[PDB]
Paper text:
Potyviral CP plays a role in virtually every step of the viral infection cycle, from transmission of the virion by aphids, virus assembly and disassembly, regulation of genome amplification, protein translation, to cell-to-cell and long-distance movement. CP consists of a highly conserved globular core flanked by two large extended regions with a high frequency of structural disorder. The C-terminal high intrinsic disorder region (C-IDR) is partially conserved and packaged in the lumen of the virion, supported by the helical ssRNA scaffold. Here, we show that we can control the shape, size, RNA encapsidation ability, symmetry, stability and surface functionalization of nanoparticles through structure-based design of CP from potato virus Y (PVY).
Residue numbers in the entry:
A (entry chain Ab): 41 to 221
B (entry chain Ac): 77 to 221
C (entry chain Ar): 41 to 76
Amino acid sequence: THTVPRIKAITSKMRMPKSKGATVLNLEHLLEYAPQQIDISNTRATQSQFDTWYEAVQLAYDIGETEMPTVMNGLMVWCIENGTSPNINGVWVMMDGDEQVEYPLKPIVENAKPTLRQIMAHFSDVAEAYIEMRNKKEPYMPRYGLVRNLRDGSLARYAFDFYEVTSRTPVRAREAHIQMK
Amino acid sequence: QIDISNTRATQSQFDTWYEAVQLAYDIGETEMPTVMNGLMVWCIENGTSPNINGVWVMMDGDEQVEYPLKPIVENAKPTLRQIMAHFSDVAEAYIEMRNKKEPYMPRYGLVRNLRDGSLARYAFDFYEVTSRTPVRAREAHIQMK
Amino acid sequence: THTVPRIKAITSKMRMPKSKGATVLNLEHLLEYAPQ
């Protein structure tokens, strides 16, 4: 009785689900299957829906693979400032120089399954990588902020309707979206 | 406590909900497990009450693969939540493994403003509050649910 | 068993109408005939 007694740690065999004696899962793989948080979320559309929403818009405008990118570059900047739920009728605008050029919104909002927000979320990372660049020159704030009274200056990078709150969001901002959304 | 609760479906209902889905996909006993592995991870992040129409996704590499939701939600008696609860214990045993590498949080938390870091293990719609729940978390579900 | 299983898309052979073994239409043209 010279050895102090150490409490034994009972082992709670987790209840692995089964159907008829065999196991349902194959943990052998479960411990290796590791996706990314965004790519299985619903805040983004599957790469199928996005592939459709890109081919269909590439068709309605009838521009061409070589130049359609430059158009999408505009759609982001437009969405950032205004939002991602406009009237199906109407025109979004992009500019060369100062000659505003309009495009019809119908082919975009219509072919966006289930909604434009999701589809535009595919540019979320690039969106913040664009606002950061913009603010460097001068103080810029997504309008989404100007209507919600945001003047952090640091939260401007994450102020637009189609930011996907992933897991790597500085929490100084995650609060903003839920409060507004 | 779990095996007589209603938050889990009887082993009959679950046995049906597994055979029926094994049929609709027509995959095979050998590989259906790997699919169910995806359904959990999908349910964890999104929930367990999606539109009967639509597709849940699982990935090999980065080529998202879609499956139809209809055969799952339909054959789940009385609801998907219950059926998915059979993976509750494995679910937490999966989140714990995930957080080790980096900070991960079920989306169920991100929408409910959860940033405990320790409660992430128990943040998903289909956790069965058994009797062995650390009470630091039992409060979360009732407040949200 | 390292490859995720992809569901096969069964192919619903539309029932092209026929009379006595031969086909009634001539899709060869149907896919080009386009009126207003």
